[PDB]
Design a protein around this nucleic acid. Structure first.
Lengths: 71, 59, 107, 50, 560, 50
RNA sequence: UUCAAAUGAGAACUUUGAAGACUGAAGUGGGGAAAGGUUCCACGUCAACAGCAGUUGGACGUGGGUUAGUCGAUCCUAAGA
């Protein structure tokens, strides 16, 4: 996840099973005010679903990654 | 510590909902933070506070 | 007493009338036992080159007369057995016959 | 089979989450009866039959 | 040549450090004290510009003769309960305020870097040159100035228990420097502690510092260090990196404990003496018998003293680590901060899975083996001209550097630098507290220093985890500020200076760089009795010279 | 042969004479598992005696 | 099947190297369908098992990993229900 974040500027989150692509897009936009180029999801065998979010060239995931708290 | 209903119930809808949203953001940040260490006793107070706020809103 | 005395070995002496499947292992065992009897040690090591030479003709076609040399070496420290130690090494010759045991001076 | 239905995959996920030995700190309580969990299962021996 | 080279390098490092410290002191005085030029700035930016200035002044020395130079210790500008190593970063002000929004009663200014008056700020610094290091530390106190007189000298002397503790630290430093100086050919010690037949070991210094602490009614935090320094090893790693051949004396809570004939109850309770072997640590374990001072080497003297506020009875002062997760508890004076100093253990060799991680790992490999800050790495670090485009480029690089550092921490290729807070616990709680086991064997921290080298409490067999748990499970828990200072000592020879006898050079010391704040009070090494040895020692250190003494001090240098 | 006189001085690097032998490895290898992740067995009990 | 080296308290069997071999492309390979369901892989570890030993594992303990407007279901219908 960290390697992809550094390379492709793609964030990765863990989402509830109920949500879908549109819900993820609306949530990220309304909570971070960031433009999302692409969104994808994948339910891991553990039981929850994670998601990959590709932003625009106008934004860098490093800023939000440092600001949220996890490094 | 935490929040108690007998003094929490003395507010209107707007500010109480705003406080609920702020503490939801706080709990989301705490959930992000708890990835590293396995034990964090502070989240119990957060859960009880959010439950109390939601219940008083409903009532 | 580090010595080096190139001997000669014929396989036909000790490989006669043995199973085709184990010709090479029998050759290996006979070679190590021959070194043991003609040196008087406890630890014997073979050479990868000698293994190549013995297997090279075939698994069931080992050549009879092979030339080998035996070197005594002092064992390293913390060796509870003894300083005695034998190491074998092959050497090819134009003709199998016409050669006998020869001690070679250290150089 | 890479074609399981969502409920089947959920069942398998719950089985995988369940598949673990006992946490060590359990034995440190007072008046304990748990010795080793008998619900542990492995694919080689037991088959859950969905 | 060796003596000349050593003296030149040490003098260069010491003068550079003194110049940096005087510059920082003048800068902070101009910003806050003296003239209120409304140019008030916080701690991180001052630390960064100080580091850049030090790097610029270091770039002009040995740039070609050798290929090894650096800043041994980052310029820590710390406040109050901080033990040391606290270096905030400019980008982390928002993060720290967000973390500390839960409670910022007595430390809001401390975390925001805008010190309130009377904060007892401390500056520590360290510079490395070709494997040799020199360190420096002192303190300053600021409070509102008079406006009637433009000279801006506020009421002269200042009052306070913390100020008295700082004065105790100053006089202790003076005494230890004097006794260390009286270790050369002038064998005649200026005291009844020897002078004709004595090896000058650590016992005398222990007695002297204990007497000074008792006289000033201020405790000593167990962080002191009187250690000879060989190249590449100076104790700057505290206890993270194992030191073996060290011949020095350190202060621990296990020390200074009540003796078998201390005329105190101490609740002995016939507790069995700990015959269990100490954990295998490659240390000499305070060889308190052999401390004969010999020439040809260098030494570091670092004294930190903990003040004693209103406490009902005597207790114990120790150090508590600080986390950065806010998930522990809530207190009126709980501090949350992320340490910024990190070191790499070259013993472990491993590769990681990030291009940025690889790049920064190789860069820090090129960098010397000493504690460093993330901001210490910058292709634009020297700051030729002051502006904000360079600052923002530095931050945009620091983001990726922080990510790679987090990757390094996630793998096992670094060690966090602990941040300690001096906290006091009465002996009664420890004496009457539960002791389930005589050992800890935690084996779950990062690495190394599991029992703190020597056991934290060989007497009574108390472990570190239990000690800290008991400490946080208290009711008074009075916090004690620490006054810290340090300096370097170099011995000399007739060959070193044929002009005079073998002398002693004090590096990062002297009044010209360690003038204390105007402080006057009482309860200061009371006269009469047998305590007069210290007063006699100070008078003799003042009057030793017939017409010139064998002690010299370095001096700073102008900017241009 | 003398051309190889380039890495001859490179064996010396300094830096505590290459960190002063292998001492951090012994303490760092004591952990049952590596990396920074939550262990449901190790993290359950803090005290080493327990 | 053979020898050497290394690890390792301890090597006919663990790893590598040096040889000999066989499967001989309707294979002991490369993919998959039913089924199997975390066994894939990484790290520390071998009392229990791999009828023999195991320093090794499809074993033990902790974790990582499956990204679909174009691939299949979801759309339609047969014998049927």
């Amino acid at each position: 996840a960290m390697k992809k974040v550094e390379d492709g500027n793609i964030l990765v989150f863990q989402v509830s099973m109920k949500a879908n692509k549109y819900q993820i897009k609306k949530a990220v936009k309304e909570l971070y005010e960031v433009d999302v180029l692409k969104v994808n999801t994948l339910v891991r065998p553990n039981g929850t679903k994670k998601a990959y979010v590709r932003l625009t060239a106008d934004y860098d995931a490093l800023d939000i990654a440092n600001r949220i708290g996890y490094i | 510590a935490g929040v108690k209903a007998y003094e929490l119930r003395t507010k209107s809808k707007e500010q109480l909902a705003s406080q609920l949203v702020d503490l939801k953001k706080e709990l989301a940040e705490l959930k992000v933070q708890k990835l590293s260490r396995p034990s964090l006793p502070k989240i119990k107070t957060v859960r009880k506070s959010i439950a109390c706020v939601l219940t008083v809103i409903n009532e | 007493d580090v010595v080096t005395r190139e001997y000669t070995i014929n396989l036909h002496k000790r490989l006669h009338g043995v199973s085709f499947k184990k010709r090479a292992p029998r050759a290996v065992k006979e070679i190590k036992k021959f070194a043991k009897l003609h040196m008087g040690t406890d630890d014997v090591r073979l050479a990868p080159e000698l293994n190549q030479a013995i297997w090279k003709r075939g698994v069931k076609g080992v050549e009879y007369r092979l030339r080998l040399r035996i070197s005594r070496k002092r064992n390293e420290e913390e060796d509870a057995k003894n300083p005695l130690f034998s190491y074998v090494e092959p050497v090819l010759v134009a003709s199998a016959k016409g050669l006998q045991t020869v001690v070679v001076e250290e150089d | 089979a890479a074609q399981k239905s969502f409920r089947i995959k959920q069942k398998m996920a719950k089985a995988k989450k369940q598949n673990r030995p006992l946490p060590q700190w359990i034995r440190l309580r007072t008046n304990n009866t748990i010795r080793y969990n008998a619900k542990r299962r492995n694919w080689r021996r037991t088959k859950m039959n969905i | 040549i060796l003596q000349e080279s050593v003296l030149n390098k040490y003098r260069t490092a010491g003068q550079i450090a003194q110049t940096a410290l005087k510059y920082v002191t003048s800068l902070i005085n101009d910003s806050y004290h003296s003239k209120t030029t409304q140019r008030q700035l916080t701690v991180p930016e001052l630390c960064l510009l100080t580091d850049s200035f030090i790097l610029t002044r270091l770039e002009q020395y040995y740039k070609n003769k050798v290929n090894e130079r650096g800043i041994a210790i980052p310029t820590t500008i710390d406040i109050d309960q901080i033990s040391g190593g606290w270096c905030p970063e400019i980008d982390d002000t928002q993060n720290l305020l967000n973390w500390n929004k839960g409670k910022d009663s007595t430390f809001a200014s401390s975390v925001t870097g805008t010190l309130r008056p009377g904060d007892l700020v401390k500056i520590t610094l360290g510079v490395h040159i070709d494997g040799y290091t020199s360190e420096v530390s002192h303190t300053m106190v600021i409070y509102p100035v008079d406006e009637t007189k433009p000279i801006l000298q506020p009421t002269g002397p200042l009052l306070g228990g913390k100020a008295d503790a700082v004065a105790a630290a100053h006089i202790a430093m003076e005494t230890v420097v004097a006794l260390l100086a009286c270790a050369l050919t002038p064998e005649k010690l200026p005291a009844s502690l020897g002078g004709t037949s004595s090896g000058i070991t650590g016992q005398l210094i222990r007695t002297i510092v204990d007497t000074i602490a008792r006289s000033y009614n201020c405790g000593v935090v167990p962080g002191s260090r009187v250690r000879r320094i060989r190249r590449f090893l100076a104790g700057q790693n505290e206890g993270i990196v194992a030191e073996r051949e060290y011949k020095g004396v350190v202060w621990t809570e296990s020390h200074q404990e009540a003796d078998l004939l201390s005329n105190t109850d101490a609740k002995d309770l016939t507790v069995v003496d700990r015959g269990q072997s100490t954990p295998f640590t490659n240390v000499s374990a305070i060889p308190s018998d052999d401390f004969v001072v010999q020439s040809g080497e260098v030494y570091l003297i670092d004294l930190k003293m903990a003040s004693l506020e209103h406490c009902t009875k005597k207790g114990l002062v120790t150090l508590e680590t600080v986390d950065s997760y806010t998930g522990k508890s809530h207190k009126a004076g709980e501090l949350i901060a992320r340490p910024g100093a990190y070191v790499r253990d070259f013993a472990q060799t491993h590769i990681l899975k990030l291009k940025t991680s690889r790049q920064l790992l190789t860069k820090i490999d090129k960098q010397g083996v000493y504690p460093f800050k993330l901001s210490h790495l910058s292709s634009n670090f020297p700051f030729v001209h002051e502006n904000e485009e360079e600052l923002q480029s530095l931050k945009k690089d620091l983001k990726s550097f922080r990510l790679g550092m987090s990757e390094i921490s996630n793998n096992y290729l670094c060690v966090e630098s602990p941040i300690q807070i001096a906290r006091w616990v009465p002996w009664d709680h420890i004496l009457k507290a539960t002791n389930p086991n005589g050992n800890l064997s935690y084996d779950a921290t990062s690495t190394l220093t599991l029992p703190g080298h020597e056991l934290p409490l060989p007497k009574l067999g108390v472990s570190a985890i239990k000690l800290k748990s008991l400490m946080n499970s208290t009711k008074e828990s009075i916090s004690l500020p620490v006054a810290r200072e340090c300096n370097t000592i170099v011995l000399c020879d007739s060959s070193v200076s044929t002009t005079d006898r073998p002398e002693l050079l004090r590096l990062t010391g002297g009044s010209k760089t360690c003038q204390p704040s105007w402080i006057h009070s009482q309860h200061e090494l009371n006269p009469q009795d047998s305590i007069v040895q210290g007063i006699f020692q100070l008078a003799t250190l003042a009057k030793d010279k017939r017409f010139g003494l064998l002690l010299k001090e370095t001096q700073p240098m102008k900017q241009k | 042969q003398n051309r190889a006189a380039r890495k001859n001085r490179y064996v010396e690097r300094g830096s505590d004479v290459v960190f002063g032998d292998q001492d951090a490895l012994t303490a760092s290898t004591e952990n049952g598992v590596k990396l920074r992740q939550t262990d449901r067995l190790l993290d359950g009990v803090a005290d080493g005696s327990m």
